[PDB]
Design a protein around this nucleic acid. Structure first.
Length: 53
RNA sequence: CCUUCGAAGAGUCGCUAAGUGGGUGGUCCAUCUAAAGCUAAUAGUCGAUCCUAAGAGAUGGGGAAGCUCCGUUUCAAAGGCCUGAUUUUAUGCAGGCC
């Protein structure tokens, strides 16, 4: 398995607000319906890996 | 016009208060509302210049209505220097000496 890089790494004020903004966008990209018939969520891996590389 | 409400200056008045309270007058009555404020009518070479001596005298602080006085290192945050791969949640100075 590949060792990727986390999006925001730090706890200073700038990094803490980066974390806030990154979590705020996670409520809209990785949605899970908690249902048996939930679809498998597929996203744009190219952009994410651009963030994680 | 109708209806529902309706605060009031304390080390102050007089050691130290009150809220139909209080202040001042009159032989019970009369009159005002303090302790807040505004408002017109011939020298690098000789000396000084530099250094400190007895002493004087700022700052810190204190007294006095004040012009000013006391006190000279005093319960003052009274200033200089050095080191470092750039300082470990990521490039907002850390440590040391007198």
């Amino acid at each position: 398995p590949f060792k990727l890089n986390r999006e925001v790494s730090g706890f200073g004020s700038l990094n803490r607000l980066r974390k806030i903004k990154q979590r705020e966008a996670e409520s809209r990209t990785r949605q899970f319906s908690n249902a048996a018939t939930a679809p498998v969520i597929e996203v744009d891996i190219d952009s994410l890996l651009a963030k994680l590389n």
